[PDB]
Paper text:
Native SAD (single-wavelength anomalous diffraction) is a de novo macromolecular structure-determination method in which the phase problem is solved by exploiting the anomalous diffraction signal of light atoms present in the crystal. Here, the combined use of these two strategies is described to solve cases of native SAD phasing that were particular challenges: the integral membrane diacylglycerol kinase (DgkA) with a low Bijvoet ratio of 1% and the large 200 kDa complex of the CRISPR-associated endonuclease (Cas9) bound to guide RNA and target DNA crystallized in the low-symmetry space group C2. Here, we present two challenging native SAD cases solved by collecting low-dose data at multiple orientations from three crystals each: the integral membrane diacylglycerol kinase DgkA (Li et al., 2013; 2 × 42 kDa asymmetric unit, space group P212121, 2.6 Å resolution) and the large Cas9–RNA–DNA complex (Anders et al., 2014; 200 kDa asymmetric unit, space group C2, 2.2 Å resolution). Here, we show that multi-crystal averaging of data sets used in conjunction with a low-dose, multi-orientation strategy is beneficial in difficult cases where data from one crystal are insufficient.
The CRISPR-associated protein Cas9 is an RNA-guided endonuclease that has been repurposed for genome editing and gene-expression control. The Cas9–RNA–DNA complex, which crystallizes in the low-symmetry space group C2, was initially solved with SAD phases obtained from selenomethionine and iridium derivatives. For native SAD phasing experiments, we used crystals of the Cas9–sgRNA–target DNA complex in which the complementary DNA strand contains mismatches to the guide RNA at positions 1–3 (see §2.1.2). Substructure determination was only successful using data merged from three crystals collected in multiple orientations. We limited the accumulated dose on each crystal (or crystal location) to a conservative ∼2 MGy in order to minimize the effects of radiation damage. One of the crystals was subsequently used to collect a fluorescence spectrum at an incident energy of 4.1 keV (see §2.2). The spectrum confirmed the presence of K+, which was likely to arise from the crystallization condition (the buffer solution contained 250 mM KCl and 300 mM KSCN). We therefore reassigned six Mg2+ ions as K+ ions and found an additional one. Subsequent refinement of the anomalous scattering contribution f′′, as implemented in phenix.refine, gave f′′(K+) values between 1.58 and 1.72 e, in agreement with the theoretical value of 1.77 e.
Residue numbers in the entry: 4 to 175, 179 to 713, 718 to 766, 775 to 1012, 1030 to 1050, 1059 to 1243, 1247 to 1364
The structure:
Amino acid sequence: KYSIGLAIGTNSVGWAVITDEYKVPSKKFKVLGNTDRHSIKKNLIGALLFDSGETAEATRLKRTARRRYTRRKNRICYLQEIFSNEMAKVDDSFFHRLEESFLVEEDKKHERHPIFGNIVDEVAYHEKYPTIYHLRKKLVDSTDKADLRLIYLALAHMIKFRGHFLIEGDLNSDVDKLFIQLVQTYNQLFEENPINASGVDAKAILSARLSKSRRLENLIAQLPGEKKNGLFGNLIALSLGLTPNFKSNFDLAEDAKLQLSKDTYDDDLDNLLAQIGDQYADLFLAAKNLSDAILLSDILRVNTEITKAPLSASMIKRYDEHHQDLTLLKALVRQQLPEKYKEIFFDQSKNGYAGYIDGGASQEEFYKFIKPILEKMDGTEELLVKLNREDLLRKQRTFDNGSIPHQIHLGELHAILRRQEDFYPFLKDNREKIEKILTFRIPYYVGPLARGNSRFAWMTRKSEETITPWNFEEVVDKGASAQSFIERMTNFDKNLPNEKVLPKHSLLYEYFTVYNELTKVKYVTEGMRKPAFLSGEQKKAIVDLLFKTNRKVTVKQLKEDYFKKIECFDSVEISGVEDRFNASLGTYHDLLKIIKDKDFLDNEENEDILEDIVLTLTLFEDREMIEERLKTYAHLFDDKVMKQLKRRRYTGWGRLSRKLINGIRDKQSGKTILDFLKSDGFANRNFMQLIHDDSLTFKEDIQKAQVDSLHEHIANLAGSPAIKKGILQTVKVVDELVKVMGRHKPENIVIEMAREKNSRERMKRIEEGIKELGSQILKEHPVENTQLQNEKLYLYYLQNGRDMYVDQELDINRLSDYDVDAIVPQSFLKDDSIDNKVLTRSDKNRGKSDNVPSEEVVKKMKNYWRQLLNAKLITQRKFDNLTKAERGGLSELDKAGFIKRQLVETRQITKHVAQILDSRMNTKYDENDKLIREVKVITLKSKLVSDFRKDFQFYKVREINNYHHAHDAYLNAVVGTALIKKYPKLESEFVYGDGKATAKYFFYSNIMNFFKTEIKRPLIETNGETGEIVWDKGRDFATVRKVLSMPQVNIVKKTEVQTGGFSKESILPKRNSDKLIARKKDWDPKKYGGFDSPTVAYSVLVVAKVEKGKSKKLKSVKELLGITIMERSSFEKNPIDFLEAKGYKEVKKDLIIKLPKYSLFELENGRKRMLASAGELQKGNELALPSKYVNFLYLASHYEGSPEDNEQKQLFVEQHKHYLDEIIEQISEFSKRVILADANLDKVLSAYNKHRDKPIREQAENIIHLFTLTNLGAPAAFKYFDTTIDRKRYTSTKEVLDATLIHQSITGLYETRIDLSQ
RNA sequence: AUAACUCAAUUUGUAAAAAAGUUUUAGAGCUAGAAAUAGCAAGUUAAAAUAAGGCUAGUCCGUUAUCAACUUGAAAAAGUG
DNA sequence: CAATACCAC
DNA sequence: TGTGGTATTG
DNA sequence: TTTACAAATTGAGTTAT
Ligand SMILES: [K+]
Ligand SMILES: [K+]
Ligand SMILES: [K+]
Ligand SMILES: [K+]
Ligand SMILES: [K+]
Ligand SMILES: [K+]
Ligand SMILES: [K+]
Ligand SMILES: [K+]
Ligand SMILES: [K+]
Ligand SMILES: [K+]
Ligand SMILES: [K+]
Ligand SMILES: [K+]
Ligand SMILES: [K+]
Ligand SMILES: [Mg+2]
Ligand SMILES: [Mg+2]
C-alpha cells in the first residue's frame, strides 16, 4: 500500500510516505498531555534536522595533552623527592613557597619571596641572574659550591621544559671544520678539478640567519667557476636542506633527488651509491655531517670554547642585545620623536614596546609597529637589520624554541650535576636518576601506564608494582606491549579467522604474489596454434632467471632474457601482463644486499628463520628491541651483517596468512596453495580458483574454519562520523514510519545520500612542491594561506605559474581572463576537485571539447606535467587523465561508463545503508532457503531527482525554508518507484541484493525520457509486459504539484543535551563579576581571575520559592535554570540538594522538566520558539511560501535549455513581476505574526522600496537573502543589496514559562503538549 | 556484486612528545607634591595552574558516540497513539 | 530590559 | 562561520 | 608543531569467482 522515500544528509534526514498514486497520505494522530487538543492532522512527509556529528579528534588532542601535564608534574615531584631531605636542612619551606607562588600574599602561609624568603636576598638574586639562563650558565661553568635552592631551580627548569625527542642518539659539529672536511673528501675524488676554499669564511656564510637558497648562493659566490648546480654546490645545498638532484652530476637516468630530512634518504643514498660506486660514500657522509652543524648553528649562536652551556649563553646574548638595543631605541626616540615616547613605551594597547612586554602584542605585531618608526628616524640602520633577521629586542621564551632538542638541555643538566656532585653526596648518588627524569619517555608503542581502568591502554607488566622512570625496563613488558600495539589493530585472515595476516614484505608473501600473477601469463609463437600457460618448469626458470636477479621484471625482459635466450623465440606475444609485472621479490633483493649469500636465501631450510626476521622487522620499529629480537640468529651472520639487518625496516601487513598460503594442503594431492601456483598441470589455477574449486578441499577447510547492535554496527562502519549520524537517524525514522502504518512494511524504500584547516594544507603542498621544483615563484610572488581559497590563484601556484596546456608563463594579475578547465569534461565526470581542474589561458587550447586533452597537447606538455607529478603539485590520478589521449583517450565504453555512473550509486557507504535496511526488513526464507525480499531497497543518485525537478519545474530554493529536504525524499520515492516499475530489468543496478557501448551510452542517457511528452510519447506510460500503468502525465504531475504545495510539513529539530568543553577556554584576569568561574577550588576569581561563558548542558523548569529581602520572605517563582556541563553530574546525583544550594526552597520535585537545546514551545497565533539556552530563544516557525512564488524566485533569480524555452521563462517572469510585492507581503505578515522584529522589518520594507528601480534579476537575488529574517533557528545577520540587517535576538526565556511545551517524536507525528500555565 | 596484487590519493581511530599563550604571585621603582597629579627610571625572567575535578588511586580517568514524552522499572530495556 | 558591539571557536 | 555569553549603554 | 601505527575507501590498472 505504500513506499518510503529518504534523503540522508549530514544535518538532515528527509522522509516521506507515498501510496500507489504517488500521493502522501494524511492521518489523525493522538495528542497527549494536559491541553485542549486531543488529536491533530498530519501529512506523512517531513524532515529531521540535527547538529553535525563530530569526529573524536578534538577529544583525543585534549586527552593526550592532559596526560602530558600530569606526567610533567610527576617529573618535578620526582626531582623534589630526591632533594627533599637535604633541602630540609637548608630551607624548611622552600618547596612550600614554590607550590603556593600563585597565591595572593593574604592567602600565603609562608613568606612571599619564593627563592630566599626575604626582600634583600630576593632582590640580589634577580640583579645577579636577570634570567634563569644566567643562572644555568653560571652553574655549568663555575667550580664554586652553589646554594642548593639555585641548583634545584636550574635542574627543574631543564626538566620542566626539556626539549624534543626528534633526534636519535647523542649530540655534542663546527660548520668551519666540517666545511673543510667536505672540501677534503671532494678533492680526494676529483684530483684534476679542485676547489680553492681559501679565504672563504664558511662559518659566517652558512650559519647566517638567512634562507637556505640564499646561503647556498652566498657560499657559491665565493667559489669562482663553481655553479650552485655543480656537484660541490649540490653537496652544500644538500647540507642546507634543499632537494639536490645528483642526476646530472653523475650522468644518470634515474633521478637522484635525495633530501636529508625525508625519511627515505637512508635508502635513497644506498640506491644512488649502487650506481656511481662506493668511493662517493665518503662525500655524501661529509654532506650530512655539515648539515648537522648547520642545523645546530641556528640554535646555539655561540662559540663552544667559551662555555659548556652554549644554549644558555645564546639566551644571554638575546638578553644583552635586547638591553643594548632598548637603551639606544629609547635614546633615539627621546631626541627625534619625543611626542611618541609615551605611546611606544607606556601604552599597553598600542603594539609598541609596552604592548610587546606588557600587552598582547606578539614579536611579529611589535616588529610591524616599529618598522616604519625605525625607517623614519635616523641612526636605526642596524636596528632595521636585526628586525629583518627576526632578531631585534628578542625575548628568550619564544615560539621558535621548538627547535631545541632535549640532548642540549641534558648537556647542561649533566654538567651542573658533575659540578655540584663534588659538594653534595646525594647528587652523585642520584645523578643518573635525575638525568633519567629529563631523558625518559613512555614509548608510543607502550601507551598509558594503566592498571585495568583505561579503555585506551594495552601495555602489560612483568611484575605488579608502581612504574617509575628508573624501573620501567624491568616492570613494563616492552616486548609484549610493542606487539599488542600492532596486533590489536591488524586484521586476521578472513579465510582462516584465527590466523594472523603475514607481513606485507614477507618473502613467502611475495613469492605467493609473484606466482599468482605468473600463472595467468600466456604466450604464443608462430608455430603453436593457441596461446599456452607457462609450465611449472617455465615458471621456476623465470623466477630464478629474472625475478631473483632484477627488482622489477619487464615484459621486454621476459621476451628477450627468457623466451629468446632459453626458448629461442625471436618473436612472442604475451597476454597476462602489461609493460612490467606488478608483483616483485623486493625483500629477496633487500636481503641479498644485506647478507650477500644467495644460497642462504634460496635454501628452503632457512624459510622459518627468514620469515621470523621479516616479522621482527615489521612488528617493531625500535632498533634496540629489533636487535634483541634478532640475537638468536647472531651466530649465522657477520656482526657487520647483523648491524645492517638492524637498520632494515618494513611496515605494513598483507591480507592472507601463512597457513592459508602455504600451510593448508589439499587432501588428494597433498599440495598447498603455493604448491599449486608453482605447478598445476595445464590448468594453472590461481588463488581465486583454488579457493573456490569444488574438486579441491581448500574451499571445504575454509568453510570449516569460519567462526553487533545496530548502533555498534553503524559506529564500526568506515566513513565520516557526520554521515554516520544521519544513518542511525534514518533507521529510527523508518522504524517509526512502519509503526505509523500499523506495522505493515513498505513495498519499496528509496534512499538518496547527499554527496560529501584546508588553508594550511594548501600552503604546505605549494611550499614543499615549489621547493622540490627549485622554483623561485614564492619569493617573486608571496602568498598567505588565506588567499589560496581562490581556485584560480591556487592553480596558478600548483602549476608553477605556467599554462597547463601551452608551455608558457601565466600572469598573476590576469587570472580573471584565464579559464579553469576540466581535464575529463564535466559532461562525463562530475568531478569538481582540483584533481580534475586546470588553469589555462584559454580552454580552446585543450583541443577538442568532446574528450580528454588531445594527443598534440600531451606530446608538448607531458614532460612538464611529469615534474609537477614528481613535485606532488599534481597527483597520479590527475596525470593519468591529462595523458589519456596517448592511450586512446576516452573510448565509447569509457563514455557509457561515466553516464551510468551519474545514475547508479556505487559508494560503499550507501550500500551499507541499503544493506542495513534490507536485512532489517527482509527476514524470512522460502522453500529453497533463499531470502524473501518483501521490501525492495532502491538507491538513487541525487542527479535523478535534480534533473526531474528542473525538467518539470519543481524548483528547489533552499533558503526559503527547510521543506526541500522533505520534498527531496518524496521525489526520491516517486521517481524511484516509477523507474523500476517502468524497467524491472534495472533492479539489478538499483535494488539491493542478488559497438554495444553506444547502445548502453544511449540507453542510460535516455533512461528518464518516459516522463516526457516530447524529446513523442503517449500521455500514459505502461510496463510493456505486465500492462501496468506506471506514469500518467495527465494527473500524476498534478499530484506531485499538490504534494510540494502542502503547507504543513513535519520539520523536527532534534533536541540534544549539549556536551563538550565546560566553557570558553580563555583564562580571564580578575574581575568583580559573579560570572567568573574558579580555576581551582580555593582560587576566588575576584582575586585570581578564571573562566566565564559556560555551555549549558540543558535547562530545567523550577517551580519553587526564593528568599526575598533582608527578612527573607519566601516568594513563589517559576523559572528556567541552565544546568552547565560542569554542574551536570552534581545536579543529577541529587537534584533537590543542588537546587536548594542555588537558593530554591520547597521545590516541586515532580514538576521539574528537563529542557535540552531546541525544546519547542508554541505561544499565540501559532507563534513558536525553540530553546537555545536558559536565557535565549530561537525562531520556531517555517515560512510556507506558496509554490508559485518559489518557482518565480528560482526563475527570476537565475538560481541555477532551448532559447525559446528560455524566452518563455523570461516572459513568464516579466508577466509575473507583481509577485515581488506579494512575496514581500507574505514575508511581512509572517514576520508580524511570528518573528516580532519590527525594527528590522521596517528596515527591510524600506530597503525593498529603495531598490524597486533595480533589475528584476537583482531584486530576486536579494529577496532570497530576506528569508534569513524568517528562517527557523538562530537569528542571523543578512544583507539586502547594500543594507546590512543585524540579527534581532530573543534574549529572554520568560514568555516560554507560560506557553505550551511540545514534546515530539522523531518524525514529529507523535506529540505531547504541556500547558505550562500552572 | 566479490577476491588477491600494483600504483596513488583520501578518510577514520590510537599512542608518545615539543614550543608558546594566558592567569596570580615574585623581580624594593625614584623624585616633586598634603592630594590627585607631573617628570623620570624600568621592562626580556620564574613559580604554579592549564578543563572544576573523580575513585577505580593508576605516572589512570575527565570535551567523540548515543538522548521527545509517558507507563513501567533500581537499572538495562520493553511497552504506549 | 532594548539595541548592540565584541568575543571565542 | 555561527551563535550563545557578556558587558556596555540607556 | 613533531614522531610512530592500523584500518577502509576511491580509482586507474592485471588476474579470477
Ligand atoms: K601571609
Ligand atoms: K660562482
Ligand atoms: K605581549
Ligand atoms: K600579556
Ligand atoms: K613568557
Ligand atoms: K603492469
Ligand atoms: K617496523
Ligand atoms: K657471528
Ligand atoms: K554529544
Ligand atoms: K556538539
Ligand atoms: K591520521
Ligand atoms: K524529539
Ligand atoms: K559558539
Ligand atoms: Mg590536573
Ligand atoms: Mg610560559
